[PDB]
UniProtKB/Swiss-Prot annotation, chain A:
Protein's name in the database: Calcium uniporter protein, mitochondrial
Species of provenance: Homo sapiens
Recorded consequence of changing residue 19 to A: Decreased MCU current
The record's note on its domains: The selectivity filter, in which calcium ions are arranged in single file, is composed of two acidic rings separated by one helical turn along the central axis of the channel pore.
Localization, UniProt: Mitochondrion inner membrane
Mitochondrial matrix side: 1-160, 212-268
Source organism phylogeny: Eukaryota, Metazoa, Chordata, Craniata, Vertebrata
Annotated coiled-coil segments of the chain: 119-150, 238-266
Boundaries of the shown chain within the full protein: 74 to 341 of 351
Swiss-Prot record, chains B, G, H:
Name of the protein: Essential MCU regulator, mitochondrial
Signal peptide span: none
Function: Essential regulatory subunit of the mitochondrial calcium uniporter complex (uniplex), a complex that mediates calcium uptake into mitochondria. Required to bridge the calcium-sensing proteins MICU1 with the calcium-conducting subunit MCU. Acts by mediating activation of MCU and retention of MICU1 to the MCU pore, in order to ensure tight regulation of the uniplex complex and appropriate responses to intracellular calcium signaling.
Stated consequence of mutating residue 13 to A/W: Abolished interaction with MCU
Topological domain spans for side Mitochondrial matrix: 7-18
Curated annotation (Swiss-Prot), chain E:
Stated induction or repression of this protein's expression: MCU transcripts are down-regulated by microRNA miR-25. Down-regulation by miR-25 may protect cardiomyocytes against oxidative damage in cardiomyocytes.
Membrane topology of the entry: Multi-pass membrane protein
Name of this chain's protein: Calcium uniporter protein, mitochondrial
Gene designation: MCU
Outcome (variant: residue 203 to F): Abolished gating by EMRE/SMDT1, leading to reduced mitochondrial calcium uptake
Residues annotated as transmembrane: 148-169, 177-198
Length: 268, 49, 270, 273, 250, 48, 49, 49, 91, 91, 91, 91
């Protein structure tokens, strides 16, 4: 006989092939496969089938365009070579053709399966495991923070010593010309010296563009100098500078995954 | 600038503690050092050339 | 005896082969390969093998499109030529019978409800509705396009006239200040005039900041001029720019939603 | 006698075929199907059909790429090998004005219940196909980078030399005024030239803005000149570049898709788009 | 031999016995297998008397398995007589029923959240108004005190012009006031550097007034006892609710 | 910078009410009071 | 600025048609206008004064 | 910005190929050629009259 | 119906092809043509047929390498798609 | 009007070509050629014609695999798109 | 059951194929045909049979180059798929 | 055990093939067939075996065009995949 039973979410159709007289089972996908793919998959399995076709129970051939899901709603007649097999094992037991009466069995099944499988404890287990990871990551960083702060507190002082040294440079260069050119000296000698200092500053601000590949602005130079004092100063203390920005880029993702899990809009 | 994208108000921008007197007390002594270093270099340059 | 060992989260099947009395191992993924790919590979590895089959514990034949993880639940017979090897992979399934029948009864009923009232056709209907609404709004943009592009080329021509009239001003000063320091005066007379012009310029660049709340950057004082000429022209050309703005804003949302719906990672449409 | 019946919200046509002399039934999709492959299916069901045609009884021939819902309202003529039929569909009612306030939400609920059950064995398939496609695009990229590196070894070098040449100009203009004011001529006769060099610099900075819409910032100038030298040299080496940047965009799209696929496969949190 | 896929491809390089040539191969993990690997190997050279890849358990692996299925473990590479060991670089139903359970409890939960979010968005706007009435007046005072700084800096710009303009055309000629007019410019440069070093911000015009605005606002927020810590909490909690109610719609 | 991300056009830029006279009727008296104190200070510099 | 986010290369930017001719054809006649507009100025201010 | 959004630290910026000792020896020879061509011109226009 | 005519010794078989219902006639060299050639000409002229066989003693099936000179001795059934024409030959 | 000449021991078919108005001739070896081989040749020579058929015994049609040497025993209505050529082959 | 009966100087073999459950006959030319051709006229008359072989001394296989008449002198076993028919041709 | 038996005036070699662990007998026609025909009837009959050769003077591979009449006068060690069968001919 030809039967079909639902295993593992899918229909399984058994059939009796003519050559070697042995049965076979076909596990066929209802939503994607047409009834042409199934009749190709029969002839793949036993090449001795010349004519194989599927009939609606009232005559007409169910042609090879329709779906398996459209075809397992009602019964049908399989015809292999000469024999017949009228197969009516689909057994669609749902007798409603109604919306809510069929939908409210799904909540019964899912709410039974929510209680039988202890899943709310699994959800709280995952919500525990995430912070269990995050507090390991907060403690790997915690003793090694106290050398990064040590390097930063020195590089800050060196950058501040650069900045006020530059302001002292301008405070001295003002005073040299102020002392000379008003009363100690002439004015008409200190005019080209002034012009050439003002042009040499424009030359050095271009040499800084050449030697650095960026523009000379005030807050885009002291940050470069701070970082260049940080990496040299952290060569000497040797605290695995790649491990720090490897650890931060994992705590900043577990911390985001906790925010995306605890989102009160969706019940996780 | 003054208002955050939600509508709040930005906090106070930090000024330096004892702010203006550090500028006013680094400008003056190095102005006097540039005062001294000009005349006591001209006293070397005027008499040897 | 034919052995199956789980290695690395995958199966490994060691088989004795007939054409050379040796053993070979086959590694295959249970999520993509099927029965008819494993027997095809076993058919490819040796030549003297000429009949291959996989049976059930019963006599029935497992076909050539069954998934491997739908085959590694129970033990199974492998038929090579005239022998019959019996294989028993380890039962690891960890899901009881009612706990494997309830979710099955959910899946079959959801599939029947999906098939019964053609949900995929209503699904394709929504994409049809979006692809018609998007076109009927892009067609309403088309009368305003010519009305925009004429006032836009007008405002671009006027701001081009303004930009070149800046440089004409920049040159006609350099002519005056070059004649009168060298020909019919000297530099001793036109020395402070250049200073007060270069200081009045630095004061007018502050007055520009006092009027409009931005600095005198060269593109930032071009975009403002162009857009202000655009509005003072487009008021007198008398088209309702709110119907341009609202509709052009609705286009880039009704298309972004369509791109979100045609996402090839997030299955909605077949 | 050819009938079009609506079963389960779908048209089902029963056509008589000449060879096996049997009626066959087609389940046509209304929205996502055309007439030109309906006729292809009708030819696939029976090899005996020489010519098959279909048209409106007052027009000439309905063409391909016509949706079924346009065709499926007139009583239209069908033509098989030497025979003619004229078929009429039934009129369709509509209950959806009040009765489907539930039903339009029922459909959207059951579609969510399907995409809950379906997506697990889809994400893995799309991820494996995508990581195959990414390596295909990498293998196709790997020879073509050689001509690009060959061009960018030289178009970089000319930009470096023009930067150092500009610095050389800025040095020589410092020199030729120093020698002409401290040795040969006065300062008080080479002062207006000194003024107009600065003024002409301030005017050339404006003419650069009028030519191309740039502010003339120092990194915004060499990175405009580098692209001009690069597309100059791309004519010289006859490099094909649209395939290159299209291929790079096709790799970046796959990288973005893998970055989104990291989240449901490993964290089992929802996906964003 | 060695395996490095820093190139994206595992570079293997093997030599046959008694050759001089250390041949290197490119093999994909996704569309390459053992078979065409051995074919690319054996079209090159002549020492193809034997070729095999055994497992570390001695047994032959089949020549149609995947490369990423191969190099994830070790393998004994065997050519005609020589042995090369390789050192390469080394609940799903519960989640489904959780997704299937949370598919049913969204249509009620979003409706249970929307009215609560409308309730809180109304209560916070009830909270806001007796603070907003004070804040608009304090902001108006800060606006007026900032505007009187802008037009007062314009006054210094317009007064320095006059004091440099009367001398150099009536009383003190240009040749004995030009050093004054240079050092006012250089003192205007030193002050622009000192504003940088003293406030840690570049001296640009639209940021300096929005610096002085916040000073003229936080001097007046305490002197009229505006509890600003309340205001930037309510203004955060309204917009955070509104971004959620935008998400409940689509 | 003239168009938004969606291709829409930016709104009309703001201008302050009757403003060019507001910036022009401040510079002139502050240019005369920068001129008067010039003589008021210089005629005392040329005495002390 | 050279490469995009992906790694692709930005297209060749536009250059203005007859641009460097159009800058000098406006500089030079207006240099002559700025010459003639103030050669006839000092003679007039000397004639009146 | 020296610290990114995740709190990490930006990579090291690099000085180029002993640039300090070749900028210093490219600003000098062109200055020597400049004073040479300036003396050449200031003599040549005196010989040309 | 099927008619077989000895035209100067050469047999000519007139069979009604079921695609377009007009008869077609076939002519056979009775030594160089076998059953596998005649059925291939049936499937090659008309293409609407997909099963054809020749049953001589009314029980069993003639193979695809019997010469027609052995088949025309006796009467044989000829099946087409669902039809069974019993043709009687001249002797 | 068709007049067929036997030549070198084989017939030479003279066809009035009705689209381009000429009268063409062929050379046919009817073992490796046949009737349908000839019907290919009329669409290849005169590419302006599309419908062609051969009705030999004044009733019915010939296959596309019978040889012309086997066709010599009967007349044939050679018909092209909208015409008729009711000719008898040479003997 | 498989039987061999002489007809007009050629042996006729009647075998029951397993795809349809029909009997089929084969006429062999015993001199010019080998066993390697008789085993190929079974698998194309019926494509459903995949391993067919002949055992002449009832223990060992016969390779596919032995002439048909050497096989017909002494009885043998024909194996089709899984069935073993024990044949005995006569003298 | 490779055996050569004369029957009907012809040698019938019996070889054990390793795919199906069972024997196989041949039929050699020594005047017509050469060594190469016998070597082709091993890789045709069983496709599992892949290397085969013949060592008659115990030293060398015998040439691929030797007649069996020029082979059976001594022994010939036959190699299959790795197995060596020393044969002895009847005289
Ligand atoms: Ca001066």
């Amino acid at each position: 006989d030809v039967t079909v039973v639902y295993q593992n979410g899918l229909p399984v159709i058994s059939v009796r092939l003519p050559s070697r007289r042995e049965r076979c089972q076909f596990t066929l996908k209802p939503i994607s496969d047409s009834v042409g793919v199934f009749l190709r998959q029969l002839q793949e399995e036993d090449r001795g089938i010349d004519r194989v076709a599927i009939y609606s129970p009232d005559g007409v051939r169910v042609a090879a365009s329709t779906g398996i899901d459209l075809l397992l709603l009602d019964d049908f007649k399989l015809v292999i070579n000469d024999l017949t097999y009228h197969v009516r094992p689909p057994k669609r037991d749902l007798l409603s053709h109604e919306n809510a009466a069929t939908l409210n069995d799904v909540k019964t099944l899912v709410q039974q399966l929510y209680t039988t499988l202890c899943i709310e404890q699994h959800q709280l287990n995952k919500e525990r495991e995430l912070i269990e990871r995050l507090e390991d990551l907060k403690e790997q960083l915690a003793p090694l923070e106290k050398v990064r702060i040590e390097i930063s507190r020195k590089a800050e002082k060196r950058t501040t010593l650069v900045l006020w040294g530059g302001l002292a440079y301008m405070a001295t260069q003002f005073g040299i010309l102020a002392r000379l050119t008003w009363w100690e000296y002439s004015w008409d000698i200190m005019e080209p010296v002034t012009y050439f200092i003002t042009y040499g500053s424009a030359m050095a601000m271009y040499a800084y563009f050449v030697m650095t590949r960026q523009e000379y602005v005030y807050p885009e130079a002291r940050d470069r100098q701070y970082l260049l004092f940080f990496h040299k100063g952290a060569k000497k203390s040797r605290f695995d500078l790649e491990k720090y920005n490897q650890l931060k880029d994992a705590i900043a993702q577990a911390e985001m995954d906790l925010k995306r899990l605890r989102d009160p809009l969706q019940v996780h | 600038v003054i208002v955050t994208r939600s509508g709040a108000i930005l906090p106070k921008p930090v000024k330096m503690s004892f702010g203006l007197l550090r500028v006013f007390s680094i400008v003056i002594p190095f102005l006097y050092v540039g005062t001294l270093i000009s005349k006591n270099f001209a006293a070397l340059l005027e008499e040897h050339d």
